[PDB]
């Protein structure tokens, strides 16, 4: 409380409580994050105040005081986990899923560019402004605190936007996981439900399988030497795309393929897919935003 005033509990976040503040010196509003409990955190995190974009929510401080870690944020009003509710009986006019989906894929090209990977994108971490704006947030974070099974208030950390590179044990990770969980989320603007809702990993990636096909060894070279790979997985035929995102386009089908690939060398990257021809007449529309 030295430093800011706490106006309320935003909310209860993946690492620790989320509060709007005010900054006592600037008189500006901020989202503060307490991170629950290390040196090598600090230094990575701190590295994120560098790592500037107008589609990345402004890291403004790594405030380490009181042998407690506080990440001071840029706030805003609105997630797309909420929007998207709001928005259920209508579902998002496609300009402004347009428009997002170019506004994401251009921070993920920035950071991506920079070698820094999000790997827990979400519709909760995706932020709105009343200016037509979307902005990641918690980039580079997973890079430090890990993902939990659960959070600090022992809700359920969501495996819906989990790449299956990741669901199959790999321990490494590259800029390819955040590919996915954008394409999943595109899929779950078009259609008012999510891609692939898996209570349990084995659920998930069934899901994965029951759309998508059960992968093998001519779509994804290295697959059954997984480590969480079994060969009694069942196998599934793939679905038509047509199918699973009606009424997205063949412009929008196409580039949903290409990053919903299962091969992560396959995946279609940031940088190319802002190129694709889904986006020759974007636009940015303002969305209706009530606060």
């Known amino acids: 409380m030295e430093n800011f005033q706490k106006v309320e509990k935003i909310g209860e976040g993946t690492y620790g409580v989320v509060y709007k503040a005010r900054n006592k010196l600037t008189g500006e509003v901020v989202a503060l994050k307490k991170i629950r409990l290390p040196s090598t955190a600090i230094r990575e995190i701190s590295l994120l105040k560098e790592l500037n974009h107008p589609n990345i929510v402004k890291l403004l401080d790594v405030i380490h005081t009181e042998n407690k870690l506080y990440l001071v944020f840029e706030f805003l009003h609105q997630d797309l986990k909420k929007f ?53 947030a918690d980039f580079g974070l997973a890079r430090a605190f890990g993902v939990p099974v659960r959070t ?29 969980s954008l394409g999943c989320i595109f899929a779950e603007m078009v259609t008012r439900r ?5 209570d349990s990993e084995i659920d998930q990636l069934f899901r994965i399988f029951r ?45 949903l393929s290409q990053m919903l690939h299962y091969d992560p060398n396959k995946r279609i990257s940031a940088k190319a897919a802002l190129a694709h021809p889904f986006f020759q007449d974007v636009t940015k529309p303002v969305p209706h935003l009530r606060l």
């Open 211 to 255: 759309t998508l096909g059960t992968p093998d060894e001519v779509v994804w070279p290295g697959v059954t030497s997984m480590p969480d790979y079994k060969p009694s997985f069942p196998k599934w035929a793939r679905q038509d795309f047509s199918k699973v995102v009606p009424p997205l386009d063949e412009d929008g089908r196409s580039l």
């Open 84 to 136: 998207m509710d709001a928005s259920a009986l209508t579902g998002i006019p496609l300009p402004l899923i347009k428009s997002y989906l170019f506004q994401l894929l251009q921070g993920l090209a920035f950071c991506h560019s920079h070698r820094v990977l999000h790997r827990d994108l979400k519709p909760q971490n995706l932020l709105i402004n009343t200016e037509g704006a979307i902005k990641l």
């Open 152 to 180: 600090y208030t022992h809700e359920v950390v969501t495996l819906w936007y989990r790449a299956p590179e990741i669901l199959l044990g790999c321990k490494y990770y590259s800029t390819a996981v955040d590919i996915w």
């Open 194 to 198: 999510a891609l692939f809702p898996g």
